[PDB]
Design a protein around this nucleic acid. Structure first.
Lengths: 210, 59, 114, 148
RNA sequence: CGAUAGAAGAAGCUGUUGGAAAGCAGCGCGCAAAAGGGUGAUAGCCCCGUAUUUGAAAUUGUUUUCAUACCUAGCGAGAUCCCUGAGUAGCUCGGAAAACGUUAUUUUGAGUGAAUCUGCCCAGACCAUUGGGUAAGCCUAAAUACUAAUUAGUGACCGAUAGCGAAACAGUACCGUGAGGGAAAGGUGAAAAGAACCCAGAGAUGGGAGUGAAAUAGAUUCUGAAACCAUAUGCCUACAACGUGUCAGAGCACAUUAAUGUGUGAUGGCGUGCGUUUUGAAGUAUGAGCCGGCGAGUUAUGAUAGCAAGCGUUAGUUAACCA
RNA sequence: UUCUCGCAGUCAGACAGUGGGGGAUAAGCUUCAUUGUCAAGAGGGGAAGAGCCCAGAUCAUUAAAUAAGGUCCCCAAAAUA
RNA sequence: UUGUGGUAGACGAGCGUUGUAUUGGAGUUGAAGUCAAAGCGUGAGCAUUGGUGGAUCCAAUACAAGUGAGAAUGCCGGCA
């Protein structure tokens, strides 16, 4: 599945660039990607959810009740999970973390498989340093390029390895673009985007880890 | 979650578990055994499977 | 995170009170009584399903014997005239329905006479 | 596997929850028996209790140990069967790290164990040779030097 | 270099639903801002604004650089010269800590009490060899918890029987003398455009005429359900011992979540409530007035087992820490 | 049904028949073993009837045979010597 | 073929459900939601329509459950 380079206008060129073997996998596995997105998607908590249990609520314990010569229960405590005193034995804690961990070899297999799938999904046209230059700070030209090839199906995630002022100025005021670095990646991002752009150089760099 | 020292002082462990215990009539009284009984009650012994997990998981 | 859903209980209450109907006093107005009365109504339905077979069997026996006694025969004797003679698949309920047909039981009693 | 169609391989086995109805499984019965001490509040008693029964651990003598206040020094052992598919003449400490054999912080003397003969001409250094192991390495047309 | 005043700072029209648009449709336009909200429904370009962008009058702080007190500083030869932190080290009756339960080690409540450098103590009793260093004088930045307190910001943060006793004029009223204990709270309507005129009525109050897009937008208040209290529509409906019921069902009123339709019921059969804990209850064993809200099987460090997955012949796997 | 394994429920039992011990062959009585019942499982029958007899209920049915047992009426069932 | 009685219990099939992210949609030319009907389901439920309300929710794979109310001589509130 050789991929042809594309220009900033949307027209292709005469060089269909060969795909590095550092992304194509042998067998497709759905469990490593599943638990990788499981661990990555979580941990949105900021310790926000916190409640006071019966031992954490404020109050002076006393017994206004007398068991004999009364109709209600004894209930020598007033801050109960079922009275108006409050305090539930079960609730959210600011210390729960739900520890999860991913190995090295399984992570490598999952990343290689997802690189094979995303490179062969054919939702990408290769870019080069030449179109990186002569780039205005306007996001309007970026939108012109995007709609020239009309990538209006899914959000597009570019992967970059070198920083340019045009890149930081542009690609920042559009609802349908996102940019990340070669090693600043996570399978959750790839499967969420379902559309991406890749530069020529990073293929050989990623070939190393395979 | 520790290893119970006070209970582990009375047994030995071998390959693939197989906890080993001692033989009674050794501490305070044993003028009541035959020579056969004296020598075989100096040797070692095994345990039952009724508490096998409950002692293996604990000790 | 606190879970909502203070309405699903009332939805279930309305659904289960929809089953109950035609109840006197505070039996179609109290949901706690409504649950028990719905259960008892379902058990009464089960009872009817297990009872009506025998009930209607005895009903047909009595209704047919009422006619049979007029002809001078009892039900026990009447079965014998069909058991060995006049080989048929006719039923007690079938004979009771045929009672509603005039001059046809006469055909049956002259058939066993033949 | 996208978040509108993501599926696992073979997972999602049954979980346990007992406070959500009887017909849903283990309601007020809860599976905790009836009229018991462990069944009541603060059940699941500590290990080391039999409910008043006399245990045997305190009714049993203690095993012998002729080494109190001292420990047996650890020694690295190169098993002959395992070393069969390895090759390094004149074993030294500074190279077994690459082969995942020796530890970074170790001064353990080497001991040779096993009559399971290997399949290559190798000259080896060890602090101790076992007689059966010595015969096995003699049959391996190699050599062995006795270290300290 | 900030902080405690600031300031510059891009980009839209037409028709429509419409009471009102912000929504929709047509063509757009900017973007370094299509970050967030309001704006008469459901706005990137209407604003608040924002990104970006700089500023301190006056004060304080973080340091950098410069000139610069103060003192900081080894190698050779002798000499049984002197010194090297005395009630010191020790020993006894014992505590206190040391993981220790007095034992190495440290300190002392009561006593006695040396030595010198070849000295002392120590190397979990102790001596001998070996080895450490010469306490018993003193300050010492470095990593320290916490946010009472502040800024900037965030929330698979609770949302008015929740979140803090306290969204609110909360520890408030109030109770106990007194320590102490300790309630109740939101949303009119787009803009009050807060119901003018009239009527009855002593007034209060209500009802018509109005405004307001809507008066289920009228002040009670975002809406406004069941228990509870009456009412009328079809039928039954005051000689019958009924957990007021079931199945059939005359007869009557209907005409559908349109269907072998629904509703009531003169009448025949059938017809010892529930959760509880017990040898076992119809139970006359308890408990429940009803309705509605609420209300109780979890987390952390893990281990074991089943399943699943990675790797798997010299295995797998990192803790901490760091980008 | 035998082997391992995880999770267990009972752990204060009662009822019929027999052999019983106790008692006083007085006890639907206490305590033992055996055939069954329940606790774990409905129904039909006998005046009501959990443990007595007949027993083993996926369900709909207004079908058949019928189990013990019953046949003047209640209510299904016949008479003759 | 056994079936399909069943306490405790082991055990399978699952559902509803709030929030997360997509994937999308619907929406004052109608929404969450109230009431009713003479529906769909083996069930945990789903509805459609009508009044009713004049601004928000849903549908399908996964994620974590302060999660699912018959009594607790339950508490609160209202009504007796």
């Amino acid at each position: 599945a050789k991929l042809k380079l594309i220009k900033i206008d949307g027209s292709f060129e005469t060089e269909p660039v060969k795909l590095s073997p550092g992304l194509i996998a042998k067998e497709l596995k759905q469990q490593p990607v599943f638990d990788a997105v499981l661990v990555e998607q979580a941990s949105w908590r900021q310790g926000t959810h916190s409640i006071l249990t019966k031992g954490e609520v404020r109050g002076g314990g006393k017994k206004p009740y007398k068991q004999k010569h009364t109709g209600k229960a004894r209930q020598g405590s007033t801050r109960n999970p079922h009275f108006v005193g409050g305090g539930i034995v079960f609730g959210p804690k600011p210390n729960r973390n739900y520890s999860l961990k991913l190995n090295k070899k399984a992570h490598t297999a999952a990343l290689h498989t997802v690189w094979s799938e995303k490179l062969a999904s054919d939702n990408t046209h290769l870019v080069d340093q030449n179109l990186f230059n002569k780039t205005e700070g306007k996001t309007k030209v970026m939108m012109q390029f995007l709609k020239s090839a009309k990538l209006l199906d899914k959000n597009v995630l570019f992967v970059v390895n070198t920083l340019n002022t045009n890149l930081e100025q542009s690609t920042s005021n559009i609802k349908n673009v996102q940019v990340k670095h070669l090693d600043k990646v996570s399978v959750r991002d790839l499967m969420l985007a379902n559309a991406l752009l890749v530069e020529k150089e990073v293929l050989k760099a990623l070939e190393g880890k395979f | 979650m520790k290893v119970k020292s006070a209970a582990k002082k009375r047994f030995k462990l071998t390959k693939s578990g197989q906890i080993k215990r001692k033989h009674a009539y050794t501490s305070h009284l044993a003028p009541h055994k035959t020579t056969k009984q004296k020598r075989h009650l100096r040797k070692q012994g095994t345990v039952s499977a009724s508490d096998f997990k409950r002692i293996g998981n604990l000790i | 995170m606190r879970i909502k859903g203070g309405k699903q209980t009332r939805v279930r209450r309305k659904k289960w009170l929809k089953q109950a109907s035609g109840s006197f006093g505070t039996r179609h107005a109290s949901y706690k009584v409504a649950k028990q009365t719905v259960i008892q109504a379902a058990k009464y339905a089960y009872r009817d399903r297990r009872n009506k077979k025998r009930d209607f069997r005895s009903l047909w026996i009595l209704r047919l014997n009422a006619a049979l006694r007029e002809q001078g025969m009892t039900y026990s004797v009447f079965i014998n005239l069909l058991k060995k003679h006049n080989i048929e698949i006719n039923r007690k309920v079938l004979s009771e329905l045929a009672i509603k047909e005039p001059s046809k039981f006469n055909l049956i009693v002259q058939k066993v006479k033949s | 596997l996208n978040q509108l169609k993501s599926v696992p391989k073979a997972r999602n086995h049954k979980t346990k929850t007992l406070g959500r109805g009887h017909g849903s499984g283990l309601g007020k019965t809860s599976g905790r028996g009836q009229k018991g001490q462990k069944a009541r509040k603060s059940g699941l008693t500590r290990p080391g209790f039999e409910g008043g029964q006399t245990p045997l651990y305190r009714r049993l003598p203690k095993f012998g140990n002729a080494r109190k206040g001292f420990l047996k020094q650890e020694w690295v052992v190169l098993n002959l069967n395992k070393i069969a598919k390895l090759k390094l003449d004149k074993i030294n400490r500074a190279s077994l790290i690459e082969k995942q054999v020796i530890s970074a912080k170790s001064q353990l003397p080497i001991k040779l164990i096993g009559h399971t003969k290997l399949e290559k001409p190798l000259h080896f250094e060890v602090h101790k040779v076992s007689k059966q192991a010595l015969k096995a390495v003699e049959n391996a047309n190699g050599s062995v030097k006795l270290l300290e």
